[PDB]
């Protein structure tokens, strides 16, 4: 059977800018090469098929070129929206072969997070657990710092965090940070702090609330 | 015009056998326009090929699979079907229904050209749990309202607002296992502050569990 | 593509000391920074000044836009022989704040700028720590004098220390920079009587 060997498996690059991907079969599949797109949770795209025809819709920015081993596809000028994994296909034999995948990230500029603190709903406190969200929303770049504080005591182990793909506009990132206590240390302690640090911030940022 | 929809259980216990369906509309499933193929996807991993189906009903299988997938038409009901037996946490996936036009200058030219959705699929012993929504309410111009999905299973469950109305500036973020076996996420959402005086609901679903919730949020 | 920046420092063109004045709004993909560059012409730094080189050197050089602070009661013109343009003259992206006239009483104000545009702005200000007391009442009339900065993630307080450090570019004084990263439909607010340097225009970061 034919594999087929994609490279890189990650890359970044500012809007604007080219960008291409390669592909390489085993051996020849003359031109039955397919290029995908996969926006994440979604199903794959066909944005090229026969090495370089596009689909009807897919912008002009999106072009493929090769034939026999070799493969192309290359973005002429990155859009926000082009954030994906990208895959290529050889058709020529059965069975097909998918590529191992590109993921397309977006370079922006730094952009620091804008915090905020949730307490617990009434309701989640008579069932007899609490969880306490931090949010920061819309920064970049994606490594971040977060730390709780009650009653300004340093929490470790008690929380998990959650982080969502780069948006398709802007580029940035937004994160969770979720502590979660029994209902019996929620009720304990009086103020509950989210600590932020991260490149955007010349100094962390605290947020907080009064139980 | 053809579009397709998988359906199908999202949970199946060890050793069991996985089946799902694949609708096809706005075509014939056997006029030889297509044909017809299965996909998955383990989390964070590419595309896998389980097989095709063609106009005549013949197959073509991954070789690492044959011994447990079968993939079938039924063009009384414009559907084709995908069978897994044996199934291992392995076999924990997306799974996406394709189609590919046929083509007379290669048989395979036009690649997949027509997707499904994709469905997810788990394989665990554990059971179908339903959903808990939580408010999310509390700086100057703008603040945050958000929705916390607590204790569900198994994956996944989709989140929008105001029935799909408010959309920009809304973040669900991607579920968490929690240490219980259970997953939790929440959905948020950045609005003007001086509209805290209009109405923001967040509309859960749980399919897996048959359940629907809709709650609203406010300090 | 390359900008050489000679003289100037690369915090320079934030804040533009006369040795800064053609880099004010540069655009270049890679910056050669030299041995030979200073950020000021009056003595100080920034205060946290590698991160802040850090995020320029990312990006693709700067665009300024005005921020639209107006002033009653005061003089906007305070200027240095420190930072000569053949003549006493000061920052270019700043305002140095002063009583109307020495010893005069200077009032309690507020400032806020909303950044509307759908990039974060790089608000800079500076703290000035004036030689002396006596020199600190000249330029900005007597009693304590007090700087808050807000914005929706900061709220911090400065309060000057004045005191004669050795004589830097001829001057015993410090005038020490501040940063922060104001997101999209964000306002900045400053509030202070004295001792304070303004901001006259923003920094937005070019794509690289
Ligand atoms: C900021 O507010 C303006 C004015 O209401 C609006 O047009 C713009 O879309 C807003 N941008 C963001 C990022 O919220």
Same mark, same amino acid.
């Given at each position: 059977?034919?594999? +087929?060997?994609?490279?890189?498996?990650?890359?970044?690059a500012? #809007?604007?800018?080219?960008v291409?991907?390669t592909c390489?079969a085993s051996?020849?599949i003359?031109?039955?090469?397919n290029?995908?797109?996969?926006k994440?949770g979604?199903?794959?795209k066909?944005?090229?098929?026969a090495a370089?025809?596009?689909?009807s819709?897919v912008?002009?920015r999106?072009?493929?070129?090769?034939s026999?081993?070799?493969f192309?596809?290359?973005?002429?000028?990155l859009?926000?929206?082009?954030?994906?994994?990208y895959?290529?296909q050889q058709?020529?034999?059965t069975?097909?072969?998918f590529?191992?995948?590109?993921?397309?990230?977006?370079?922006?500029? #730094?952009?620091?997070?804008?915090?905020?603190?949730?307490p617990?709903?009434?309701?989640?406190?008579?069932?007899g657990?609490?969880?306490?969200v931090?949010?920061? !929303?819309?920064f970049?770049?994606?490594?971040?710092k977060?730390?709780?504080?009650v009653?300004?005591?340093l929490?470790?182990?008690?929380?998990?965090?959650?982080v969502?793909?780069?948006?398709?506009?802007?580029?940035?990132?937004?994160?969770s940070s979720?502590?979660?206590?029994?209902?019996?240390?929620?009720?304990?302690?009086?103020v509950? %702090?989210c600590?932020?640090?991260?490149?955007?911030?010349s100094?962390?940022?605290?947020?907080?609330?009064?139980? | 015009?053809?579009?397709?929809?998988?359906?199908?259980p999202?949970?199946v216990?060890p050793?069991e056998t996985?089946?799902?369906?694949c609708?096809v509309?706005?075509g014939?499933?056997s006029?030889?326009?297509?044909?017809?193929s299965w996909?998955r996807?383990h989390? *964070?991993k590419?595309?896998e090929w389980?097989?095709?189906?063609?106009?005549?009903?013949?197959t073509?299988?991954?070789?690492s699979?044959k011994?447990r997938?079968?993939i079938?038409?039924?063009?009384?009901?414009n559907?084709?079907?995908?069978?897994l037996?044996?199934?291992?946490?392995?076999?924990?996936?997306?799974?996406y229904?394709?189609?590919?036009?046929? *083509?007379?200058?290669?048989?395979?030219?036009?690649?997949?050209?027509?997707?499904?959705?994709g469905?997810t699929?788990?394989?665990?012993?554990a059971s179908?749990?339903?959903?808990?929504?939580?408010?999310?309410?509390?700086?100057?111009?703008?603040? %945050?309202?958000?929705?916390?999905?607590k204790?569900?299973?198994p =994956?996944?469950?989709?989140?929008s607002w105001?029935?799909?109305?408010?959309?920009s500036?809304v973040?669900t973020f991607?579920a968490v296992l929690?240490?219980s076996?259970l997953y939790?996420l929440?959905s948020?959402?950045?609005?003007?502050?001086?509209?805290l005086?209009?109405?923001?609901?967040?509309?859960?679903?749980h399919?897996?569990? !048959?359940?629907?919730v809709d709650?609203?949020?406010?300090? | 593509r390359?900008?050489?920046l000679?003289?100037?420092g690369l915090?320079?063109?934030?804040?533009?000391?006369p040795?800064?004045?053609?880099?004010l709004?540069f655009?270049?993909?890679?910056?050669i920074?030299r041995?030979?560059?200073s950020?000021v012409?009056?003595?100080?730094?920034?205060?946290? =000044?590698?991160?802040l080189?850090?995020?320029?050197? =990312?990006?693709?050089?700067?665009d300024?836009?005005?921020?639209?602070?107006t002033?009653?009661?005061?003089?906007?013109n305070?200027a240095?022989?420190?930072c000569?343009?053949?003549?006493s003259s000061?920052?270019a992206? +700043?305002?140095?704040?002063?009583?109307?006239?020495? !010893?005069?009483a200077?009032?309690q104000?507020?400032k806020?700028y909303?950044?509307?545009?759908?990039?974060?702005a790089?608000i800079?200000?500076?703290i000035?720590?004036?030689?002396?007391?006596?020199?600190?009442?000249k330029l900005?009339?007597?009693?304590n004098?007090?700087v808050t900065?807000?914005?929706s993630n900061?709220?911090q307080?400065?309060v000057p220390?004045?005191?004669?450090r050795?004589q830097?570019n001829?001057?015993?004084?410090?005038?020490?920079?501040?940063?922060?990263?104001?997101?999209?439909?964000?306002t900045?607010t400053?509030?202070?009587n004295?001792?304070?340097?303004?901001?006259d225009?923003?920094?937005?970061l070019?794509?690289?």
């Amino acid at each position: 059977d034919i594999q +087929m060997t994609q490279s890189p498996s990650s890359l970044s690059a500012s #809007v604007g800018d080219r960008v291409t991907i390669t592909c390489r079969a085993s051996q020849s599949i003359s031109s039955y090469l397919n290029w995908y797109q996969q926006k994440p949770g979604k199903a794959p795209k066909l944005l090229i098929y026969a090495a370089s025809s596009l689909q009807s819709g897919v912008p002009s920015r999106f072009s493929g070129s090769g034939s026999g081993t070799d493969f192309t596809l290359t973005i002429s000028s990155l859009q926000p929206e082009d954030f994906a994994t990208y895959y290529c296909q050889q058709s020529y034999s059965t069975p097909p072969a998918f590529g191992q995948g590109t993921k397309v990230e977006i370079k922006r500029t #730094v952009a620091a997070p804008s915090v905020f603190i949730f307490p617990p709903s009434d309701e989640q406190l008579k069932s007899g657990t609490a969880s306490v969200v931090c949010l920061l !929303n819309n920064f970049y770049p994606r490594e971040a710092k977060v730390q709780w504080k009650v009653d300004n005591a340093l929490q470790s182990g008690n929380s998990q965090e959650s982080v969502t793909e780069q948006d398709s506009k802007d580029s940035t990132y937004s994160l969770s940070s979720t502590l979660t206590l029994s209902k019996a240390d929620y009720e304990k302690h009086k103020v509950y %702090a989210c600590e932020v640090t991260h490149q955007g911030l010349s100094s962390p940022v605290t947020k907080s609330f009064n139980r | 015009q053809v579009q397709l929809q998988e359906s199908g259980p999202g949970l199946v216990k060890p050793s069991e056998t996985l089946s799902l369906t694949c609708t096809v509309s706005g075509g014939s499933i056997s006029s030889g326009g297509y044909y017809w193929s299965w996909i998955r996807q383990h989390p *964070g991993k590419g595309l896998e090929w389980i097989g095709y189906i063609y106009y005549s009903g013949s197959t073509d299988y991954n070789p690492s699979l044959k011994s447990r997938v079968t993939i079938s038409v039924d063009t009384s009901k414009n559907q084709f079907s995908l069978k897994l037996s044996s199934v291992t946490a392995a076999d924990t996936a997306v799974y996406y229904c394709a189609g590919g036009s046929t *083509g007379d200058r290669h048989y395979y030219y036009y690649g997949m050209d027509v997707w499904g959705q994709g469905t997810t699929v788990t394989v665990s012993s554990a059971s179908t749990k339903g959903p808990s929504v939580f408010p999310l309410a509390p700086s100057g111009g703008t603040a %945050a309202l958000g929705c916390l999905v607590k204790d569900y299973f198994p =994956e996944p469950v989709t989140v929008s607002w105001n029935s799909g109305a408010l959309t920009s500036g809304v973040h669900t973020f991607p579920a968490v296992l929690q240490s219980s076996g259970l997953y939790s996420l929440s959905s948020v959402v950045t609005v003007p502050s001086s509209s805290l005086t209009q109405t923001y609901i967040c509309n859960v679903n749980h399919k897996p569990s !048959n359940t629907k919730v809709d709650k609203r949020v406010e300090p | 593509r390359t900008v050489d920046l000679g003289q100037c420092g690369l915090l320079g063109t934030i804040t533009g000391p006369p040795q800064c004045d053609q880099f004010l709004e540069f655009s270049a993909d890679l910056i050669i920074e030299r041995r030979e560059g200073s950020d000021v012409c009056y003595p100080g730094k920034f205060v946290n =000044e590698e991160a802040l080189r850090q995020i320029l050197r =990312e990006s693709g050089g700067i665009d300024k836009e005005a921020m639209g602070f107006t002033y009653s009661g005061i003089r906007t013109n305070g200027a240095t022989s420190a930072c000569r343009r053949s003549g006493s003259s000061f920052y270019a992206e +700043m305002k140095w704040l002063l009583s109307n006239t020495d !010893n005069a009483a200077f009032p309690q104000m507020t400032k806020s700028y909303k950044n509307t545009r759908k990039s974060p702005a790089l608000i800079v200000w500076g703290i000035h720590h004036s030689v002396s007391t006596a020199e600190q009442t000249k330029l900005y009339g007597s009693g304590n004098k007090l700087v808050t900065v807000g914005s929706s993630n900061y709220q911090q307080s400065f309060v000057p220390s004045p005191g004669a450090r050795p004589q830097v570019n001829g001057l015993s004084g410090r005038i020490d920079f501040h940063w922060l990263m104001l997101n999209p439909n964000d306002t900045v607010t400053f509030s202070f009587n004295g001792a304070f340097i303004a901001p006259d225009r923003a920094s937005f970061l070019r794509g690289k």
